[PDB]
Every structure is written in structure tokens, then in C-alpha cells.
Amino acid sequence: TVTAEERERAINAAKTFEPTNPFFRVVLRPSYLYRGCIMYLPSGFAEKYLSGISGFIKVQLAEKQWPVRCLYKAGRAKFSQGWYEFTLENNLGEGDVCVFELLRTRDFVLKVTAFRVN
């Protein structure tokens, strides 16, 4: 069981972290956490940094990388294929808070730091 206090704690820890690279934060919720699901990235961040992002990008957690399809189309960036599997293989669940930062690499790499509830 996840308590309300744990949720508040994890969100506060995530909010304290301020990467030097461009970043956004997202609290994982159930509609993002099942096989075949999608997840839209924040629209402002997507417009500023992810125009022309296409195809399988690298999502990195603890120096391991997962392929996640990220398509920017009709004004929104959407994760699809590979996103759920990234969360499952990293034992991420609802309430965990992920900070995604855009690394200074040739291709698109989003590095995740997870602030886990339990």
C-alpha cells in the first residue's frame, strides 16, 4: 500500500531536484502504466526541445537504456511502444515520480531519475 504521506514525500524530493539539462517531471499514474498504453509528454517541453523527434529514442535509468517510440505529430509528443516495458523492467509503479532530463548527446536521450514512493 502507498500512503498519502509517501506520495507527498516523493513529490517533494522530485521537486527539489533541478537538473542542469532541460527537464520535466511526471508522477506515474495508472493510465500510463499498462501494456499498449501511451503517454503524452508536456506540450511546452515538447515544442521547445522535441520537434522532429521520431522513432525509437533512448530512455536511460541507472546507465541502462530502453527503446521507447516517441513521435511528435500534430503538435504533441507521445510515447508508445516500449514505454510500458521500460516501467515494468525498472519496477516503476503508480505514485513514483520520474524526472526526465534531455542529455547533451548527438541523438535523443532522456535520462530518468526516479523518486519512488515505497
Between 30 and 55, name the residue whose CB sits nearer to Cl ion: 55
Between 33 and 71, name the residue whose CB sits nearer to Cl ion: 71
Tell me the three state secondary structure of residue 61: strand
Residue 55 binds Cl ion, judged by CB under 5 A? yes
Residues numbered 60 to 79 that lie near Cl ion (CB under 5 A) are 71
Stretch that binds Cl ion, among 16-24, 38-46, 51-59, 82-90 (CB under 5 A): 51-59
What CA–CA distance (Å, rounded) separates 16 from 69? 29
Q: At 56, phi and psi to the nearest 5?
A: -85, 115
